[PDB]
Amino acid sequence: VSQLTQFGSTLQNIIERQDAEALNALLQNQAAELILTNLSIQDKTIEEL
Amino acid sequence: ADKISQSETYRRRRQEWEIQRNNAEAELKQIDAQLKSLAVRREAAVLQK
Numbered sequence: 001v002s003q004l005t006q007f008g009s010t011l012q013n014i015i016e017r018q019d020a021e022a023l024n025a026l027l028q029n030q031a032a033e034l035i036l037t038n039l040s041i042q043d044k045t046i047e048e049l
Numbered sequence: 050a051d052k053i054s055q056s057e058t059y060r061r062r063r064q065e066w067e068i069q070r071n072n073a074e075a076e077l078k079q080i081d082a083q084l085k086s087l088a089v090r091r092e093a094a095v096l097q098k
Binding site: 037040041044045047048 | 086089090092093096097
């Protein structure tokens with residue numbers, strides 16, 4: 001049983017880690033998508049000048 | 050001599066109306082470009098939305 005509890009603590013640590021790393025990759029894909037509109041806005045500011 | 054001086058008066062007056070008409074036309078012309086710049090500025094505000 002004490003061996004099983006040790007697998008349970010390793011498993012909880014893995015679950016927490018992998019879910020947080022999937023969030024880390026989500027925030028990068030989301031800022032990569034947000035940048036394009038800023039490029040379009042800056043380009044139209046040049047045409048305004 | 051008074052007939053001649055009246056004639057020269059009417060001529061000088063007409064030239065001053067060229068100065069005024071050209072000034073009005075130039076102001077009209079610059080307003081259109083002001084509208085073009087504002088049309089861009091509005092496209093950039095829709096894009097910010």
